[PDB]
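Hey, sorry for the delay on this. The queue was backed up all week. Below are the sequences that define the complex (chains, strands and the ligand SMILES where applicable).
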Amino acid sequence: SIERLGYLGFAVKDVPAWDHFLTKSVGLMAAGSAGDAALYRADQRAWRIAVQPGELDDLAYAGLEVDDAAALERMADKLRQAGVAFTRGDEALMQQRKVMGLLCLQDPFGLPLEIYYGPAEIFHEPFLPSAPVSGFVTGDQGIGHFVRCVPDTAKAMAFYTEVLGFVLSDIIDIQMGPETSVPAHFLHCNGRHHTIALAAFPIPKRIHHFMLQANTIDDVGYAFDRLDAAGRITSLLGRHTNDQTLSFYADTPSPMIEVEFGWGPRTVDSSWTVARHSRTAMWGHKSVR
Amino acid sequence: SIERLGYLGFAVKDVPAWDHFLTKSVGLMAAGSAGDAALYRADQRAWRIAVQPGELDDLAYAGLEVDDAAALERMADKLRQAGVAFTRGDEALMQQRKVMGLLCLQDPFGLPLEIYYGPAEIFHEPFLPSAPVSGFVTGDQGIGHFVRCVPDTAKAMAFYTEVLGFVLSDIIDIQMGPETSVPAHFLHCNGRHHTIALAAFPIPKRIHHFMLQANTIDDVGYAFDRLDAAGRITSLLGRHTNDQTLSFYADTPSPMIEVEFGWGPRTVDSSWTVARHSRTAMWGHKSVR
Amino acid sequence: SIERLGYLGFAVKDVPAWDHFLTKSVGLMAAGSAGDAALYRADQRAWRIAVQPGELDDLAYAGLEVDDAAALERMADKLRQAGVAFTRGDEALMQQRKVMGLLCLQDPFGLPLEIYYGPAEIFHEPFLPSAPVSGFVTGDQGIGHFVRCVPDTAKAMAFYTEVLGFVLSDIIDIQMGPETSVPAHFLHCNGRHHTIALAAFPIPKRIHHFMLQANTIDDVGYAFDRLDAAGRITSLLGRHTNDQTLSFYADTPSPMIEVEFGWGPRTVDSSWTVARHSRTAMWGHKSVR
Amino acid sequence: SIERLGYLGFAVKDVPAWDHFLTKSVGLMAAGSAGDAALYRADQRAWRIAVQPGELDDLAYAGLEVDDAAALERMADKLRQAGVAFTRGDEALMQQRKVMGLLCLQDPFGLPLEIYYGPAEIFHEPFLPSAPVSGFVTGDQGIGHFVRCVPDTAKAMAFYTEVLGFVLSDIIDIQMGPETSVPAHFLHCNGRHHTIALAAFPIPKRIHHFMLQANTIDDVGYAFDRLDAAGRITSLLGRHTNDQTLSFYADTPSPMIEVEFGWGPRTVDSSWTVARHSRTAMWGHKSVR
Amino acid sequence: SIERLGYLGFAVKDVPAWDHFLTKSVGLMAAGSAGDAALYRADQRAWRIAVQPGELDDLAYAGLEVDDAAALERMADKLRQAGVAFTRGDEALMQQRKVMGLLCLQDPFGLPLEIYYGPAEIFHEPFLPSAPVSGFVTGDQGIGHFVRCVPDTAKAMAFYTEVLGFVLSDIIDIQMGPETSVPAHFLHCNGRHHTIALAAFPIPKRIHHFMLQANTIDDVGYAFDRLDAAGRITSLLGRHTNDQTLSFYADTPSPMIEVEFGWGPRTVDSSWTVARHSRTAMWGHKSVR
Amino acid sequence: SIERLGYLGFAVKDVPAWDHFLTKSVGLMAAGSAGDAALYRADQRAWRIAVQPGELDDLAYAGLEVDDAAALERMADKLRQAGVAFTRGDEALMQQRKVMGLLCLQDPFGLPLEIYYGPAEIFHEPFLPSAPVSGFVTGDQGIGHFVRCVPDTAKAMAFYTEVLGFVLSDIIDIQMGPETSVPAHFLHCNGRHHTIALAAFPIPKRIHHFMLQANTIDDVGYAFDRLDAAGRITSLLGRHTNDQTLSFYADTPSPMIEVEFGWGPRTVDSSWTVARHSRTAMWGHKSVR
Amino acid sequence: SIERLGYLGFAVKDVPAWDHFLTKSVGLMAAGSAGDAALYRADQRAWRIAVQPGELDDLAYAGLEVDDAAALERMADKLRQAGVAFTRGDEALMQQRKVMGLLCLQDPFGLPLEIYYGPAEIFHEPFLPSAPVSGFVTGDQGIGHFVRCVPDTAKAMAFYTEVLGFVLSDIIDIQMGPETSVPAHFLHCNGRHHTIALAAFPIPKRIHHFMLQANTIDDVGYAFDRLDAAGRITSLLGRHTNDQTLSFYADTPSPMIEVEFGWGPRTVDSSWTVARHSRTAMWGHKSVR
Ligand SMILES: [Fe+3]
Ligand SMILES: [Fe+3]
Ligand SMILES: [Fe+3]
Ligand SMILES: [Fe+3]
Ligand SMILES: [Fe+3]
Ligand SMILES: [Fe+3]
Ligand SMILES: [Fe+3]
């Protein structure tokens, strides 16, 4: 029922650092501010990523998008039935997020979520990258995806699939040590292979990384050099086994939070078949961190 | 449930003026008369626009099309259930409109509507424009669209969506003054971004303008010169934020009633997402009136 | 529910004449016999048209095809419920028609119909025309169409649509005299604009004509010369207003029964809209008979 | 060396008749006048066909187009070398024809020809047909073609090919009587199968007919009805053996001068092979005159 | 300079056998006769293959086609210069071959050749196969190809390439025995990989086989069954190493003369590179004879 | 022989103004400096436009590009033969222009030209617009075009065509007053309709305007708003008669020097035909200056 | 005049190492031997790369391919005229290289070259990679390219371009140190951006590296892992500035000789323009050696 991941908000110790990072390195377009949040664009939306000051140095909230007012009410009904606590956003928050309506809640482990509809668009102010990137693949598939760290994967799954409507794409057993592996669960809610992945990682953050998809392979290759020059590279170029995203990872200014910049993944449809993978990389992705 | 806007009828103080306007300027094909109404064609339909003498100088009625006899009966049932008053058209009116069946009613604010099915087509008399226009985009998306002025938008919405079946595409807050803006609601009932838009405008007419879509950009550019020569231009070429219709506006011979001539808008489908815009123009559309 | 018109059987006074006609003029492939019926092919089916001796000089029966055994049983249930009398074909008839199952019945006015499934195909004996025709458009749309003459159109309609599942495409008012016109009703049951049309014609036959669709326009042009040389032409080339079939008509050896040979008609889909036409010809089709 | 047939001028006894004919029947756009010549357009050229008063009731002259000033001078040199008499057009004639330069001459049998370059175009006045025709195929292939009647075909050939540069496409032996046939020679100077054809016909005119090519088959079918209603049809629809032009012929208001309206012919290229045909019609083209 | 192989003439001991073979097995269309030669068509040409009575039971002559009259004269000049004896065909022979002009000669080893231009075409009598074959690939690439047996390959090469203009495509060393192999030389004169191949085979005939190319793979598969039923198969289906023709061979009624029926070979262009192959078959082509 | 217009250099009274103009308004990418010239990029070239301080406020020089070293030498030979004075650029100038070789000269009326080869490209520094423009159409067609003002058009023509190799596309008679018109000559040297146009305009500058071609129509529409906001618009959107460039004009910071921003013009090829036009605008282009 | 690089032969100290390398790492297909040379295939050619024992540990010879026998003779004539010493290969060498003819020579600095024609192909033994690679891009563009180290670039250029016919694509100044850069010259002889590049590198080998082009990007990514596992990687993935080859470099078992494995480069045509680049990498290609 959730249609796609619409936006992301971070609370960070170094806002200027994040600002230079999202613009000069990632290529996002600086789009003013809202309250104490610096806004960044990747397309026609008024904003896609917000950065506000905070000791968390983590993802502060994620906006899950539905297609209309009725859709939002149906979601409220679903939350009620599932016994999930939520608060309807007030005029102030609606004004802040630039949405027509939203329900604020949390997943089983504390990550604030905001189900909303009616996002603001500013076509009269065409997107202009701050670095050389031909553009980002968003649209119906949203802004990108992120891997959510959870203490209990089965519990996170029930909520994301049963309450929010995400559908399992596949699983990848991620080798942690000699005989230690974590089964990462990749979920989709539209054509993007996965919008949210759940994994029991020994990480002190709400997420491992967030991913943005560029239009061309050169976008990625160019982006890799920009981040290598910034000395932020954590992995060499590679392609994933399940979604086939060709990408590289890099450190954001927030310790233990990374960004993935990729291109050309496979998409999901009705006939999608659940499968299991033993490795995350088809090829490449050698760790550099 | 209404499938598309099929026809439009105007009651005007200057019929010869409207006649020269629809033909020499807009390019429509004169198609004889019915009663005291001059008929005009834009394609294979026996008529699409009718012009009759009247002090109103406004839209007299709008024909909403359904795909068959059963569809019309289902609509009657819906009107009954909604408590909406209607009268089945008699042989005379059917003969006049050249339709197989129709229900006559009014929207909440007095605009006569006629739900019909089985329109007449005259393929043996191929459309021939009266001015240089390659053709119009009609077909499944109907004749075009119009913006309906209403005193109460919420009330108009309930009727058009709940009773007639239109679906909200998006909203554009139209700046009226210093701190005055009107939220225009754009509704679709097929692939055309919108067939009817509702807005609380301080206009003494039932509508602000009606829109026709030509096949090429040159059609529009050529049309702009024809209307500029007639001195009717009210806006320069531009493209809208929501549907991306590239067009210009011009005054019809009826004061405060305009026509929009455009090309290449985006179309709507199942996956359409409701959004909000702060401006009507992506670019251009500078007021000239 | 009927999926398409699968076959046609004629009972004629001059079988050799019909044989030379279907082969040398129309181009069908002679395919042996079954009982006292000469069989003719137009594609991979064991037969599409059968010709047997008889004083009728008219269509003897029409095979309406469904996609499987269950489909046929569902149709029997429907006939039962509608009070329509029918007999399940015996081994003998199944053997004769080369089908896996069939129900024999009659429409409201005596035309024998046979609802069947599991037709026989002989791919090991590729279709070979008897005259120069690149091929026929059949497949999912069946063998072609025919216009059924009826005394009561409303009564025929109820049966064909309500009992058999055909859907109205459109209507054409056919001028008969000074102030006499017959509203022909065109029905579809798949992508072919119409498989059966009903009209109250003052003709002493069950049908006016049957139609076959060739692959190219040259097929038709070539066919016209072949039939003109046989002196059978009844109409010049033309294109119809509703389906846009480009064709010509010719007399079969059975008096008052004609054949239509055409190309490139428009096809029907979910979004089809019922409409009315005042003429049968878009252009051409001048009577020659 | 001649690049294409650019224009045609007729001298006729009934100008109003020719005017109604070229516009209401053929669909050409009336384009004012030059001297005592009424001009008609088929596309972006200022004019393509001119009609002036005269007892001839025949083609008065044909404009053969080259691509530039040098090209015209090279042609003058060629005429000089071939001993062909010519006169360079004066300012007056250049003004009249709306060309940048032209050489006036005659073919071996008296038909005035004008080799020119730099034709005038009026894109600011888009072509608008006077009858329903989607458009004409001109461009690099010129306005169309015409069949030139000559007393000596071998003599006409030497001139058109050796002096003017036309290249033989093929020949069609046209049966005249019991044992009388005329070998028509079809010549091209660009992609159009033929721009000029030569034949020893017992006709008292400089040409048999001129041909115009419409964009669609419906254009032709529609045109046939328009001319049949005018009672001018001389041949039924058909397709030619050599160029495969699908067309019909009709009488112009000038006795023994016809017009051919067609669609979809084959085009010529480098690899074209000369061939011989025994008939003019692939199919159709039955004489009606 | 020769443009393509246009026709073939055989002199055979059993004409009725060859007639049933070319029609019922190969699928060619019987096209009457000329003198004592039975003619057969494969497309729009008046004839492509001729069969006349004779003790030879071999290829009697091959028609090499040029694009026009000048081309033929240029070829005569070339023959003169090369000292090759030739005779211009008289009206009688021109009438017999249905060509506009031809030069009769012989290759270095006695095979009569006829260089001609202006072949006759009969589009008013569309090709109609005598057996199920969708059509043949001819056109600019001619009727097909044949392998010419010669006592001296170097001598044959000089003539075919130096005098007639054929260009070497490649060579295939054909294993004859333990340590005996014949280098077959494949020559092209257009896009067809080869129109004539030369090889020093111990065969008492002028040729080994002639080849015809069908439009689809099913054409070939179907043809194989037809000839297997006739018990004429000499090789199983296979694909050649150099041209990639997928085909099978079969015996004609003339002992030691075979026919090849194939599909989908590669074509030749300007950039073609000469190469050498050790086998004739890429796969398949197992001998059955 | 000149292959395309590679670069442009301006000498202006207000460099900061030109800098803000080329970047914020036009969208070019600032690319450092060379000597006292500020460089700007539109694609992969190290620079395309240079701006240096000077009282001229006009085009200082134009770089005409050839494909290699030999090409440049052939051009020197041509200049020698034509008696045109030129100087080979020294290491310093080569270093300044970033080219491998260049010849410096002047056209008949003082505009410095530099024929060069081997331009520098910096793919490792991807083009990044300074304003929202999807990109520019350059490549084989160079950077764009410019209209050169000359006192004697015939004299300018001889030089540009006879010495430099440009080819005339067409002419447009530009109405100056009541009975005063200037015949503008448009020249091409590649697929771009024209790279240089010559016209006898009463302007005190070397050029009237220079033109840049964007990838999309939205690029232009967006650009128009940016320049209108800067209050520099001199013409409304429109499309030209000859090249069909859809564009608008605007004033550069240099008085009487304008810029044209357009999209979608037609391109030129071998078969191009010289023609004459009476107006510059197909539609639109209303003067605003 | 040389058409493409056909083959390469190496003389190496460790043949088994090279064998495992070309097969298990690169993916080439082992194809037996010739004399003391192990042969390897990448496509339909009998062999593309040969490896023989030798102390050189360098490229032993390069086969330059022409399209036919005449072409080879024309090349001999050219060598004679240029005073370049050469020896026609004997039966033995022809047998060894599997070519129909070849001329053996050396470039100005000792690298043996063999101009040949008529290479052997074995389609009956389809290419089968020894490692996972979808295939290689060869065909008309040959096997790949190599960078030739030379002491005098101007001298090497004159020979390769003036004697052998290669054409300069572009130049890249390769930074060697603080103020030391080597101008690498890239030459083409077909569509491949470059087949041979010349550069004054301080390397004790005849070449720096040879390049092979795979069909997909995954081929390269997969290949990179295979060679990284072998610990041979010398550069990370990257894309070149001039040809845009996306690739990585790796060490062959021969010290100071590398291999480049890439995909998707740009191709060259008639309109190619010579240009200069300051870096070899568009992005990536970070040194790892
Ligand atoms: Fe990821
Ligand atoms: Fe509108
Ligand atoms: Fe019909
Ligand atoms: Fe004609
Ligand atoms: Fe063969
Ligand atoms: Fe311009
Ligand atoms: Fe390389």
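The first strand of chain A starts at residue 4 and ends at 12.

I'll add it to the shared folder too.

S.
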